């Protein structure tokens, strides 16, 4: 068998609050900061990144480069040849993390505002550290079906599962590139876990903190995993009448299996 060919796609890189990895002001001098910016729909190079086979991420022929290996320093654009090559190498993980192998630090957006300077931080699997290479500048709106065929629904600040109904906007969830799950009625709020301990009731809270408790991944086995805690989304005691969705260790019983519908 031939080894799979490794292509070099050209994509945008979407992250916190759906903003795009952006080379500030379209300037390409060495050291110019990379930022979050509203996603464009044109062919401007400063938001289109080439994922090359040498694990470098390039816009307009120059590399996405970390300034240093300490948590807190910013990420810039730079000549791929004249920069420290270890500072230009990046791994893109299936769980949404973009890591620099030399430093083990993670591309992050410590603020959710337009123009935020991108930095490298210690991995805590937060929303501020979630990314997705794509050309889709909008999140995917979906219904989440779970135990007994019921649908996840949001009311005020609470979340539970009720009978499915197409006209219920409170049952529509937008899956953002940063790993957060947000109610369609209020894209400023997130499916949030209070603590990293078991049987913590999940709520609907503001995405402001962009915390580890607000980042989720749909696993191949049907579970919705909170990466930092390692706990999964659980219909407590398999009883929807409790109106409690919680974090709980993975065990695979039907009260932990979900499915995103279109």
């Amino acid at each position: 068998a031939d080894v799979c060919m490794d292509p070099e796609p050209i994509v945008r890189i979407v992250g916190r609050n759906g903003l795009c990895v952006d080379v500030r002001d379209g300037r390409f001098h060495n050291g110019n900061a990379i930022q979050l910016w509203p996603c464009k729909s044109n062919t401007d190079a400063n938001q289109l990144w080439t994922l090359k086979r040498d694990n470098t991420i390039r816009s307009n022929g120059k590399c996405l480069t970390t300034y240093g290996y300490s948590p807190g320093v910013y990420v810039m654009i730079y000549d791929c040849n004249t920069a420290a090559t270890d500072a230009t190498r990046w791994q893109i993980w299936d769980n949404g993390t973009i890591i620099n192998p030399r430093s083990s630090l993670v591309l992050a957006a410590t603020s959710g505002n337009s123009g935020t300077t991108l930095t490298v931080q210690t991995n805590i699997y937060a929303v501020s550290q979630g990314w997705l290479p794509t050309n889709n500048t909008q999140p995917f709106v979906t219904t989440i079906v779970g135990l007994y065929g019921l649908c996840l629904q949001a009311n005020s600040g609470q979340v539970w599962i009720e009978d499915c109904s197409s006209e219920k906007a409170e049952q529509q969830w937008a899956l953002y590139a940063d790993g957060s799950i947000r109610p369609q009625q209020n894209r400023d709020n997130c499916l949030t876990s209070d603590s990293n301990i078991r049987e913590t009731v999940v709520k609907i809270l503001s995405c402001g903190p962009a915390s580890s408790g607000q980042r989720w991944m749909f696993k191949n086995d049907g579970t919705i995993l909170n990466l930092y805690s390692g706990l999964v989304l659980d219909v407590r005691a398999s009883d929807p009448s409790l109106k409690q969705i919680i974090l709980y260790p993975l065990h695979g019983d039907p009260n932990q299996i979900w499915l995103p519908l279109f």
Partner: nanobody
């Protein structure tokens, strides 16, 4: 329809005592079916107590009762257990075993057993 729960084992005990409640199911594949315990004190609402998944690995407990009760399952005997240790006056009530469901009409209760003090 013939699916039915028979709770048993409630009694009158004094604080610090212990009791094991048992509910025996019939009419369905008992294995893999989640089973939960509820209790309704005089005047108050039915409140969730504990619940077991497919294995005894999987157990959910209300805060009121952690570290004292143990929900248990014996698939061979079609039986759910609620071991009740270090009993308190606050635990008095009728204890119901329930098979939860998506619609409330498919919820499945037994007749409950009385626990006092």
């Amino acid at each position: 329809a013939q699916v039915q729960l028979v709770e048993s084992g409630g009694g009158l005990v004094q604080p610090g005592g212990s009791l094991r409640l048992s509910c025996v199911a019939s009419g369905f594949t008992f294995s893999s079916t989640p089973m939960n315990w509820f209790r309704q004190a005089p005047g108050k609402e039915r409140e969730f107590v504990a619940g077991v998944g497919s294995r005894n690995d999987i157990a959910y407990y209300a805060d009121s009762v952690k570290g004292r009760f143990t929900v248990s399952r014996d698939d061979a005997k079609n039986t759910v257990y609620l071991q009740m240790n270090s009993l308190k006056p606050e635990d008095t009530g009728v204890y119901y075993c329930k098979r939860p469901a998506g619609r409330i009409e498919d919820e499945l209760w037994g007749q409950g057993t009385q626990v006092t003090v």
